[PDB]
Amino acid sequence: LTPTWRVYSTGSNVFQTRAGCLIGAEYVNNSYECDIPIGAGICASYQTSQSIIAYTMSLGAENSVAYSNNSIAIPTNFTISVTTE
Amino acid sequence: ILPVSMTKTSVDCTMYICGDSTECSNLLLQYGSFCTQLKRALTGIAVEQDKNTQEVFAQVKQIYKTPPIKYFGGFNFSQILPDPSKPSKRSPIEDLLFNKVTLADAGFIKQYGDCLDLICAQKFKGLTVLPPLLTDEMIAQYTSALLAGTITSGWTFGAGPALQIPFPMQMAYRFNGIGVTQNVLYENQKLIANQFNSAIGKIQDSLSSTPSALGKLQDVVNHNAQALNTLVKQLSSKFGAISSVLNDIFSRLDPPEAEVQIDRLITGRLQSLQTYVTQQLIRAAEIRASANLAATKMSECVLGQSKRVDFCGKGYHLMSFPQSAPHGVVFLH
Amino acid sequence: QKLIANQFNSAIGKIQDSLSSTPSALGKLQDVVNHNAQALNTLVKQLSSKFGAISSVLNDIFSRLDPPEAEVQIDRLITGRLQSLQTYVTQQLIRAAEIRASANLAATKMSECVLGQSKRVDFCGKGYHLMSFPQSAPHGVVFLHVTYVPAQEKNFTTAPAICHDGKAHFPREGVFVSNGTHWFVTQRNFYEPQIITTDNTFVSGNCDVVIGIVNNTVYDPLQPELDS
Ligand SMILES: *[C@@H]1O[C@H](CO)[C@@H](O[C@@H]2O[C@H](CO)[C@@H](O)[C@H](O)[C@H]2NC(C)=O)[C@H](O)[C@H]1NC(C)=O
Ligand SMILES: *[C@@H]1O[C@H](CO)[C@@H](O[C@@H]2O[C@H](CO)[C@@H](O)[C@H](O)[C@H]2NC(C)=O)[C@H](O)[C@H]1NC(C)=O
Ligand SMILES: *[C@@H]1O[C@H](CO)[C@@H](O[C@@H]2O[C@H](CO)[C@@H](O)[C@H](O)[C@H]2NC(C)=O)[C@H](O)[C@H]1NC(C)=O
Ligand SMILES: *[C@@H]1O[C@H](CO)[C@@H](O[C@@H]2O[C@H](CO)[C@@H](O)[C@H](O)[C@H]2NC(C)=O)[C@H](O)[C@H]1NC(C)=O
Ligand SMILES: *[C@@H]1O[C@H](CO)[C@@H](O)[C@H](O)[C@H]1NC(C)=O
Ligand SMILES: *[C@@H]1O[C@H](CO)[C@@H](O)[C@H](O)[C@H]1NC(C)=O
């Protein structure tokens, strides 16, 4: 169906996902912030020359609390924040 | 137990109503755009489900980790923290809940290659399922990060930077927050730890037992399945026509009245689709309201200590623990 | 006071820059208007549908058809358009329901953040709520939440209790911290060390039931100087 939709050739590798088959985007192992949500944790964005790339979403920045059996952290400063809603 | 999201579905009117019939496509074209509203509504519903999941679960900007040593003032959280000895980094209680909920799900299958039989056979009838944006191992990672933050930092990580604190010290200050002096904990720590361990084990026994209390999550799945089954069975309705098959109508009838015969069939099936869409939107609204309540409960019981009566459990609230469930969430108060 | 006023002024100016910026975050108010306009437009456009009839014009269908079948042709068009109106009304009610829910939430938030101070976490802004300000918007309302966010933390040494004379001492409304050699008492939300005296602690029990007690001294502010 839609015979005109040849979608050129396999210039960009076809990436197979659980949602389906995506043609026209190149998979990368780098994790970036989501731009266009494809689904199942995969998002696509326009970046660097310039092309459309597909990747795996990152939950957030890693952290590790320095826990100890005698230790506490107390602030020495404060910040006043104004937010909209 | 609180529902969070539901299944994302898409329906193709042209193929569902008139499967492989060009004459039907030309005749449906005279009705204008009778399918954009349904497609737009379904896309909005799917986006709403994804947004609901993101608001409920994505509340921390950092992925905290627990120290390798699992000694917290004598308390044992080994039955709720994930273990790396499984492909799914899930707690034993999480595994029990998923095993209990999995009698029916969407199938887990979305490649469509292995379909040679309820979903993919309905796939030939324009009922597909879109995958959730967050997989269960990312929802699990979110829950594990939230649990780690709560055990280590307490309520400090929910309003800025995570601040470390000994676990007995956080319990003593939390007790002081409800009108009980901290010497009570410092003198009955062993008894309190024993009671907590026994209570957790009884939680495991309660869930592992037969009287499944997870009816709220099962009701949504059952309703969706039954609605889809009714819609697919509705294709057999005659709607006043001599027959329910378009090919048969074209072969056995001349155009002059075949036009109205199919117009009647189109009207009946379009009415069925609009009714189904209305039912889906109403259920989407109730599920979204439930999601909003769940979000309020997470933010007010998990991220802090609540003074509201009978809001986070029954009695005098101390803390709550989140666990992930299929299209839902489970709290331990 | 001066620093806090400067921070508040800077935060308000940044709020102006955020709103005046091109990436408008006011999509919630625009979504409702867009949805209503699109629904109304499709309702208007639905008039041109033939509904399977011979023609969509009443005058043409009346002049070019006999009454025996013109009646049912008009009845078909009437039924189709009535179905369209009932549908439109249904989505109008569902949207009104959602609007009412949002309005109820907004009213509760205004009454609980603007008219008072809220202890509910992540309800009136993000952080520790101080006050909120309402602003009027077309078919909506905008809140400006002022919160308190700690910063510049420092590590210390801490104890649950301090043993002085075979007695356990506990803080009144503070924590026990130590910069090393010495021990001080400070509030738990801001660093303000103080000497641990009998007016900063209360005595309960002995020095063999609390895990982690530390030997130290508690100063008596009455006997040494007012010994006359
Ligand atoms: C928090 O830290 C900031 C930056 O170190 C302090 O701001 C400085 O304050 C001093 C005196 O008030 C000024 O001379 C500097 O010009 C300020 N610099 C900046 C970058 O703001 C602030 O006073 C601290 N707040 C506390 C300790 O409560
Ligand atoms: C907390 O106490 C339990 C006692 O049952 C310790 O043993 C765990 O028991 C559960 C339930 O049978 C098992 O699923 C775990 O595998 C057991 N843990 C281990 C290490 O064998 C548990 O270890 C204790 N947790 C602590 C001390 O953190
Ligand atoms: C913690 O800070 C206090 C205050 O600076 C230190 O207490 C001593 O206080 C006397 C009284 O003025 C000073 O003459 C000493 O110089 C202070 N000691 C030091 C090392 O500065 C206390 O010693 C500090 N504790 C540490 C650094 O472990
Ligand atoms: C505070 O001083 C007492 C002084 O007795 C310490 O008590 C220890 O234990 C018994 C007495 O209960 C005796 O052996 C000694 O008097 C002490 N030393 C040892 C090695 O036992 C007590 O341990 C001190 N507290 C802290 C936190 O050091
Ligand atoms: C606290 O002390 C206990 C005592 O053995 C130890 O098991 C645990 O690892 C310690 N926790 C720390 C140092 O964070
Ligand atoms: C305490 O030291 C640890 C060292 O890993 C650091 O991560 C933490 O930020 C420090 N907390 C302070 C300085 O309040």
Side-chain angles (χ1 to χ4, degrees), chain B residues 18 33 40 92-93 121 130 134 142 148 170 187 212 226 230 232 236 241 260-261 272 277 286 290 315 330:
Chain B
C18 35
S33 71
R40 283 188 289 95
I93 293 181
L130 308 171
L134 285 167
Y142 281 164
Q170 183 197 136
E187 291 165 1
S212 64
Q226 164 180 73
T230 71
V232 178
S236 301
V260 71
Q261 283 309 92
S272 315
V277 80
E286 50 209 270
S290 174
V330 175

Side-chain angles (χ1 to χ4, degrees), chain A residues 2-85:
Chain A
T2 70
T4 302
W5 277 62
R6 77 278 184 194
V7 190
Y8 39 93
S9 180
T10 319
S12 77
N13 63 330
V14 286
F15 190 52
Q16 157 84 28
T17 77
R18 289 176 65 191
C21 195
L22 72 79
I23 307 189
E26 178 197 11
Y27 192 66
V28 293
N29 290 15
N30 305 334
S31 306
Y32 296 147
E33 197 195 20
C34 188
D35 207 349
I36 306 158
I38 294 133
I42 296 183
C43 303
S45 179
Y46 193 40
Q47 271 154 1
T48 291
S49 71
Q50 307 296 125
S51 196
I52 290 176
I53 52 168
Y55 53 88
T56 296
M57 208 34 262
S58 72
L59 306 186
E62 210 79 24
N63 199 309
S64 183
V65 183
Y67 177 77
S68 188
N69 276 343
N70 178 357
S71 169
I72 299 288
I74 184 167
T76 65
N77 214 310
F78 47 81
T79 318
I80 303 295
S81 178
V82 177
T83 55
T84 78
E85 169 169 37

Side-chain angles (χ1 to χ4, degrees), chain C residues 133-146:
Chain C
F133 310 110
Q135 298 291 277
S136 64
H139 296 327
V141 67
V142 173
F143 291 99
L144 282 293
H145 300 305
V146 54

Side-chain angles (χ1 to χ4, degrees), chain C:
Chain C
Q1 191 179 340
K2 169 64 67 174
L3 173 72
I4 283 160
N6 280 3
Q7 291 186 36
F8 172 78
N9 289 347
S10 75
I12 289 285
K14 188 52 216 64
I15 292 297
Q16 290 183 173
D17 297 332
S18 178
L19 277 292
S20 82
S21 176
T22 313
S24 64
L26 54 63
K28 298 179 68 48
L29 302 182
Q30 202 76 47
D31 278 16
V32 162
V33 184
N34 292 342
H35 284 196
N36 306 326
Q38 178 189 86
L40 266 179
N41 220 30
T42 195
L43 180 78
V44 176
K45 185 272 281 173
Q46 272 280 109
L47 271 175
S48 298
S49 76
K50 217 155 280 318
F51 286 128
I54 297 108
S55 295
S56 291
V57 190
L58 78 170
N59 287 320
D60 312 343
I61 199 169
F62 257 116
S63 287
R64 281 189 294 104
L65 282 181
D66 51 346
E69 69 76 64
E71 317 296 321
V72 66
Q73 288 309 99
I74 297 169
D75 291 331
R76 189 145 67 254
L77 298 174
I78 279 172
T79 54
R81 282 158 185 179
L82 269 296
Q83 149 263 310
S84 61
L85 280 314
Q86 64 66 11
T87 49
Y88 170 74
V89 169
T90 52
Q91 40 259 19
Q92 280 288 271
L93 284 280
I94 73 180
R95 214 183 320 286
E98 291 195 310
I99 293 290
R100 177 186 45 224
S102 175
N104 286 345
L105 172 69
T108 308
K109 256 183 192 277
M110 62 85 88
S111 186
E112 288 199 12
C113 315
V114 177
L115 263 64
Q117 206 190 9
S118 190
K119 310 313 281 155
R120 300 165 67 184
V121 184
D122 211 18
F123 191 61
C124 309
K126 169 87 166 182
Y128 301 114
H129 180 239
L130 291 171
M131 302 86 68
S132 279
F133 310 110
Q135 298 291 277
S136 64
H139 296 327
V141 67
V142 173
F143 291 99
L144 282 293
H145 300 305
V146 54
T147 46
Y148 176 95
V149 182
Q152 284 179 47
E153 60 267 0
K154 187 58 67 177
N155 276 321
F156 291 100
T157 308
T158 186
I162 278 177
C163 184
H164 177 38
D165 46 331
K167 297 176 146 303
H169 298 55
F170 300 97
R172 297 290 179 89
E173 185 24 63
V175 301
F176 282 139
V177 293
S178 165
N179 64 341
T181 66
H182 298 55
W183 284 88
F184 304 106
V185 55
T186 185
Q187 46 189 353
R188 67 192 90 255
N189 273 310
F190 202 72
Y191 187 50
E192 188 178 1
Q194 278 182 354
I195 166 61
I196 307 162
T197 76
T198 53
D199 297 333
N200 284 335
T201 63
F202 63 94
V203 191
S204 64
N206 56 5
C207 303
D208 62 358
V209 298
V210 50
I211 312 170
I213 193 165
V214 166
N215 293 2
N216 210 8
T217 185
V218 175
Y219 167 67
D220 198 0
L222 44 68
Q223 57 101 45
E225 65 292 307
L226 273 80
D227 214 359
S228 306

